[model samples]
Target: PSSSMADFRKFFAKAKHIVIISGAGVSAESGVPTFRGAGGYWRKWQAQDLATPLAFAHNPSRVWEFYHYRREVMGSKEPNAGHRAIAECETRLGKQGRRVVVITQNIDELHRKAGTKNLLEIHGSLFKTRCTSCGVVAENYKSPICPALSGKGAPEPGTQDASIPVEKLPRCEEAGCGGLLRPHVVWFGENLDPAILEEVDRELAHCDLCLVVGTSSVVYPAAMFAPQVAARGVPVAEFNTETTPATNRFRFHFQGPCGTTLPEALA
Candidate 1:
C-alpha cells in the first residue's frame, strides 16, 4: 500500500501536539558519522573507548582527542533539508498555535541550526563540554589535546591529529577545582537523564502524531517510543533509509534519504 503525504498532512491538520523523535540516522544525512562505521575506529581504540566512563578514567586526554575530532566533523556539516524542513514546520505550526517538539538522540545540534524552538536534546550535544567535578556545564569546544598521545600532530581545527594525557594537559578551569572536563554526552552503559525521559514520555503520550526518523529502532529508550505510540493508536509515522523492526509498526513509512522526503512530506 502506498503511504501518502496527503494523509499525513490531513493528520497534521487535525493534530495539536506533534512529536518527532530523531536518531543518529538523521544526523548521518548531514554528514555526521554513525559512530560505529567509518568514524567509529579511532587509531586502535574502538567506539566503546570514546563513549564510556572507563575510557575517560583511563585517559582523559585521549578522550578529549576523540571528542575534539568529532566536534570538528559535526561542526563542519550543515543542517540538511530534513532539518530545515522540520524547523520550518515548527515555525509554521507555532504560528498556527500548534506545537511541535523535536526530541533527538543525536548530539550534533543540527536541529538547533535548523531553528527548532521547542527542542529536547535527550542525548546532549557534541558542542558542549562539562566538568566531572562541580558538575558545571559550559558550551565549550574540546581541543587542548597534547601531541604526545596521538603522535601525528594536531591541525588548525578538524584534523585527526594528536592528543596528550589529562595530567599533562589543561584541566577544567571551572571553580578552579581542576576537575576533568568531558564531552557532554551520555556514555555507554549509562542511564538516560530522568528529567528528559519524563519530558519525552509526556510529549509522546498525549501527542496527536509521532514521527520516528533515521533510526534502527533497536536502541533502547528511543526504540521504546515507536511501540509505545503505536500501542496507543496515535497514528505513528516513520522515516528511514531502510526498514527496521519498528517500521512495520508505523502507520506510514517514508523510506529513503530523509533530507529528500521529510520536506516533501511535512513541508
Candidate 2:
C-alpha cells in the first residue's frame, strides 16, 4: 500500500499532540556511530560487553576510556535535517497551543543541539555524568572528561588498557564526596528511570498522532509504542530507510532517509 503527502498533511493540520519516537538512526544521520556490524568493536572488547555495569565495576578506567572516545566522537558531530525538522515542528505548533513531545532512544544530544525543547532522552546521554557515592547526576561536556584521559581512547585492535587508577578517572566534585563518576547512561541490565518511563507512558496514551523515526521498532517499550496507538485507530507514521516488521501495521510508511523524509512530511 502507498501513502500520500496529501493525506499526511490533513492529519498534521488537526493534530494537537504529536509524539516522536526517535532512535539511533536519527543520530546516525548526524554522523554518530550506531556501533552495529563493523563499528561494534572498541579496542579488544565488544562494544556491548563494555556497556554493562559489571564491565564498569571491574575497570572503571577502561569503561571511562570507552565512553570518552564516544563523547569525543559525538562532540564533533552536528545535528542534521531530521533533528531540525522535528524541532521546527514543535516551535511552529507550540505557538498554536499544540504540543510535540520527542522521546528519543539515542544517547547522543543531537536533538537537544537542534533545539528540540519538548524532549526526553530515555537512554540518558554521554554528556552527563553520575556520581557513584552521592548519586548526583550533572551535565558535563568537557572533552577528555579528565586530564588522565588526555590523548587517550583510540579504538584499535590489540590495544592494551591505559590502566589509569580509579582515583585518576573522572570524580565527583561535591564537598567531601569524591566518588568515581560514570557516564549517565543506562547499562544493558539497568532499569530506566521510572519518572521518564511514566511520562513516556502518559504521552503515548494521549498522543493524537505518532511518528516513529529511524528505528527498527524491535526494542521493547519503544517497539510497542506505535502498535499501541494503532490499536486505538490513531494515525501512526513511520520514517525509515527500510521497512521494519511493524511497517505493515502503521497507517503510513515513508521509505527514505529521515533527514529528507522528515522535512518533506513535516514541512
Candidate 3:
C-alpha cells in the first residue's frame, strides 16, 4: 500500500519514542563502500584473516596496513543527502519535543558529521583507535611518536607496502606506560559492547516506532531489531533503494533512495 507524508506524520504523532536503525547502505549512499560489496578492499580477504584479534596478534603490522587503507578511503568520502536527511529528522524531532535515537551498524561517523545527537554507534567507529594494553583512546588518526621503535627501526615483517609500512605500531601516549595501540573497532569474532547492548535493549523495549533505513537486514543483531519491535506491536517503517528483508516485515516500505524519500516523507 502507498503511504503519504501524513501517514508518517500520524505515526510519529502517536509515537513517544522513535528509534532509527541504519547500516552500510546508509553510508554507501555517502560513497563509503560496503565491506562485502564489489571493489571493496576487504572483499578478497577473510575477516578472520584481517579483522580478528588473532590476526592482530599474529601480525599487527598487516592489521595496521588494512586499517590505514580503510582510514584513507573513509577520509576521501563525504556524507550524502541521506545522511543529512536523518540529521534533519533528529533536529526536527528534538525541536518538536519528541524523543529520538539513532542506532547505527556503520562505523563511518557520517551520522555524527550530519549532526545526529542521540546516537549509539554499536559497531564502534573507524576514525578512532585505542591502546590494547593500557586502554588509552585516541581520536586523531596520525601516527604517534614512540621511543620503542624510534631508532634503526625496521618495518614489521609480513607488512606490505614498503613505501609506508608499519615502522612500529603506535604506542599509548600516556606517561610511563607505552603500550601497543590498536584500532578501536570491534572486529569479527568479538562481542558487542555490553553497555551499548543494554542501552539498545532499553530503547527498543519502549519505542513506539522503529525506522529502518538503507540496510540489507541480513547482518545479525541489528537485523533483529525491526522484527523485535514489530512483535511488540510497534510500527516499523523502512526506507531503501530496493526491497530488502525489512521491506517484507515493516509496516510500510518506501522503496527509493533515502536521500529522496526521507526528505520528502519528513516534509
Best by TM-score: 2
Q: Which residue pairs overlap in candidate 1's backbone?
A: 146-163, 146-164
Model 1 alpha-carbon drift over 4 Å, by segment: 37-40, 44-46, 142-163, 168-170
**Candidate 3 C-alpha RMSD relative to the actual structure:** 4.4
Global local distance difference test of model 2: 0.88
- 2 versus 3: better lDDT goes to: 2
Instruction: Report residue 182 deviation for candidate 3 (angstroms).
Output: 1.3
lDDT for each candidate structure: 0.77, 0.88, 0.74
Best of the candidates, lDDT: 2
**How do the predictions measure up, each by TM-score?**
0.88, 0.94, 0.84
**Alpha carbon lDDT of residue 127, candidate 1?**
77
Encode model 2's per-residue lDDT on 96-206: one tens digit a residue: 999999999888889999999999899799999999999999999997799999888888977778899998999999999999999999888888899998989899999
Model 2 scores a TM of 0.94
Candidate 2 runs further than 4 Å off: 37-40, 44-46
Give lDDT tens digits, candidate 3, residues 65-133.
666656656767887888887788778778877878999988888899888899999888777778877
